[PDB]
Symmetry: C3
């Protein structure tokens, strides 16, 4: 509703995860405060231009990685992006791998998820009196997924074209027994802590949201179990590749998502009672 | 404790789910306010007669479906019914099916459940100093289950005589990856959002509680994934069949549940320390 | 920070579970109040001597079993023990068995866990601005596990040397359908309600924590499902065996945990960003 400075708008949102605290990519950056009914977003939103397209960047953990996954104000974050007018949201995330062939340094563009969080407090914007139950059979925006895959291929990076993300609560990493369940029983491919309820809220807000995930580790399955320092080090080492992909894809997002390839773009039509 | 009007009592409770906001079935209806230590129940409770048996009706979502599953005051709802003196509780619910032969329009009388909720805040009435751990191996009241099955058969409707209900958090529906876990890994039969913690609280209150579920959809497994509008439309289309079953069964509930076929009727005897 | 009386310190902590409300074991007991940023621990901590080693005893449920698993102030409990200077923490717990050969009366020293809680509110001490993600691949302290096993063997008791503990929310026990998932799908060995987030917090506080579990029941798999009264009766019947093990092991804990056999002893080195 109210922004400071007033009148700011953007077309593409980028939510940065681990290792991605500054835009890097935007020209003419302005830091913006956006009012939300839920209090503060993770940080200021930075708005600027990438080759003529207006981009809003939000670090989900805040500058300096001040906010762990369970403490993020997901409602405020998504409300703020919607309020600026964005239609496309690219999430950049660090994930662990549960399979040998999804190697550290590879990108993954997931197509499914399993929610094993428990402590996120709000999993929706809609608490009544209008009851909303969005369909999320195909939870990610296909239009954006396909563009991410294409960019990665063009630039010569390895991009796995599907994957099931298991979202765990944290902040601790999984035990060996848990990780065996995720891998062998649920047949998940990658694991992270931040996707839910971010994706749920993006869908309810009728945004075209997709995740560009970077594999940073093999969970508990290597000679060395994952540590936080390893994840951070691998993301910071590879952030330049993520930046190059963003520069490639963002100018192609000048238009609007195709309705037929955006499962959530009209989510509320059939979902509200 | 206090009711307005004062002195109202009932013997059978009916909790209405999706599509069932008005009693329809009761004669001489009075709307009743029942004090609870937990604040407001979902709506007024309507008390009236069905062939000489006093019935209390509560729409779990409120009139007009104002309250989504995660926001329902389950403690207030069950406390209010207990306070009016009910011994039997029939829950009417919309569920999805995870198997081909449980078809939209069929009734199911489940015998088991798996709780995959996360955000319901209170899963018990007992927070100390008396610690209560009720056994729920067989969570539904067999006496009532059998009467529901019998009524359905007599009226010529399809009633599946068992089923495992997986209760998910919502309000979003399942992803395809989640639904595969519910179906193929957990081997659940039907899926819904409202059973837990309603059933837990009913058991702790020593009520004979059973669910009459109506299949409204096949989850994510049909050419079209479930939508909220579909569920509502199917329930409203079939509400008359649910009403006929209630009219048949309620007069047979004039007495008391048989202790040997009511797992929760003396739950507190062995459960409290 | 502040204790009353002032200046009290201890080297070994014992957290008592079901049936273990009084130390029994300590000489020269003093009841101590320990300030925490999270309010009251479950009860006074009792500090005393066992053969020259200072021991702090805390009943997790409080004296008289006043606090159910979901209502325990886990943060306060672990903070209070850390504040007194303890390096070793022995947890004594009642568990159910999901396998025929883990029989009521047997001890188990688990090596893994699966967290299926949902309502514990805080799963960490670290909510920002320093983000902490501890590795818990091997969640228990091996040094202490091995000493517990050794003591049990020396005293002639049956001690199972490994096991996966599934932690459920409660306070109700599992349905038959849930218990089949824990046993047949997750391949867990034992089940309880109190391990999480106690273990998570112990690890973050860099303590050497292990569980000595006593099997009290076979969950839903016997002619009689578990009841709370059965669990309490079996623990109180066997508490003397648990006491004998504590007297044997505590004097051997005069020193410090071996770093190479204490996965959490330097947890924060790699975990904090
Ligand atoms: C900076 S370390 C913490 C971050 O690592 C991400 N992540 C990376 N690898 C894993 C893993 N194996 N399991 C869970 N989350 C992980 C999570 O989303 C979290 O925000
Ligand atoms: C009116 S649409 C929402 C309701 O649908 C019910 N329900 C119907 N089908 C499903 C399904 N496939 N998954 C989950 N809940 C469902 C839930 O209990 C919820 O209150
Ligand atoms: C005194 S009865 C309740 C206690 O029993 C323990 N427990 C014993 N058997 C089981 C079981 N089968 N399932 C869950 N918890 C159990 C739990 O940790 C809880 O604190």
């Amino acid at each position: 509703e109210i922004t400071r400075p007033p009148g700011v708008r953007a077309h593409v949102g980028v939510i940065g995860g681990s290792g991605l605290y500054d835009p890097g990519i935007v020209e003419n950056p302005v830091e913006v405060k956006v009012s939300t009914p839920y209090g503060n977003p993770s940080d200021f939103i930075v708005v600027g231009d990438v080759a003529g397209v207006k981009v809003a960047f939000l670090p989900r953990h805040g500058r300096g990685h001040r906010i762990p996954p369970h403490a993020i104000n997901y409602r405020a974050n998504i409300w703020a992006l919607k309020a600026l007018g964005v239609k496309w949201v690219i999430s950049v995330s660090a994930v662990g791998s549960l399979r040998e062939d999804y190697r550290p340094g590879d990108f993954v563009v997931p197509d499914q998820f399993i929610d094993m969080t428990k402590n996120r407090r709000h999993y929706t914007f809609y608490d009544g009196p209008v009851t909303v139950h969005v369909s999320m059979a195909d939870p990610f925006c296909e239009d954006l997924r396909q563009r991410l895959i294409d960019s990665g291929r063009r630039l010569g990076y390895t991009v796995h074209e599907r994957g099931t993300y298991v979202c765990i609560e944290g902040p601790r990493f999984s035990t060996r027994a848990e990780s065996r369940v995720w891998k062998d029983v649920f047949k998940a491919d990658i694991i992270g802590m931040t996707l839910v309820p971010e994706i749920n809220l993006a869908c309810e807000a009728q945004l075209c949201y997709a995740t560009l995930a970077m594999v940073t580790d093999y969970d508990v399955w290597a000679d060395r179990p994952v540590t936080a320092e390893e994840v951070e080090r691998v993301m910071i080492s590879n952030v330049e590749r993520a930046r190059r992909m963003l520069y490639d894809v963002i100018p192609k997002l000048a238009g609007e998502p195709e309705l037929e390839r955006c499962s959530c773009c009209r989510a509320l039509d059939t979902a509200a009672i």
